[PDB]
Design a binder for this molecule. Sequence first.
Ligand SMILES: *[C@@H]1O[C@H](CO)[C@@H](O[C@@H]2O[C@H](CO)[C@@H](O)[C@H](O)[C@H]2NC(C)=O)[C@H](O)[C@H]1NC(C)=O
Lengths: 49, 48
Amino acid sequence: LSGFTVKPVATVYRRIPNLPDCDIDNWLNNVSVPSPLNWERRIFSNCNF
Amino acid sequence: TNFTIAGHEEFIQTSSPKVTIDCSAFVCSNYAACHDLLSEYGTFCDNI
Ligand SMILES: *[C@@H]1O[C@H](CO)[C@@H](O[C@@H]2O[C@H](CO)[C@@H](O)[C@H](O)[C@H]2NC(C)=O)[C@H](O)[C@H]1NC(C)=O
C-alpha cells in the first residue's frame, strides 16, 4: 500500500522577545522626499514590523 | 614423475538485492499540492 507518516502531536515556537520596532512609516512619511537621481536607502534589521 | 593436488576457488553471482521504490513518496513528500499535481499525470508510478 501507499506510504504513511506519523502525525505531529505538538508545535514548537521559539522567538526572541523584547525587540524594538522597525518604524518604516516614519521613514516613508518623511518631509524630505528625494529624487530618482539621489535616491536613498535605509536598512531595517533586528526589529518587529 | 611426481604430482600433487591443488585447490582453486570461483565465485559466480546468482542473486541481487531486491530494490523496491515507493514512486509516490519519492516524487512527492507529505504535501497536498504535490500529490494533487502528480495525480494529474497518469500511471507512471504504476508502470515503475
Ligand atoms: C527625516 O529626514 C530628516 C533629514 O534626512 C532626518 O533628519 C536627520 O536624521 C538623522 C538620523 O537618521 C540625523 O543624523 C541627522 O542629523 C538629521 N538631520 C537633521 C535633523 O537636519 C530625520 O531623522 C528623518 N525622520 C524624521 C522622523 O524626521
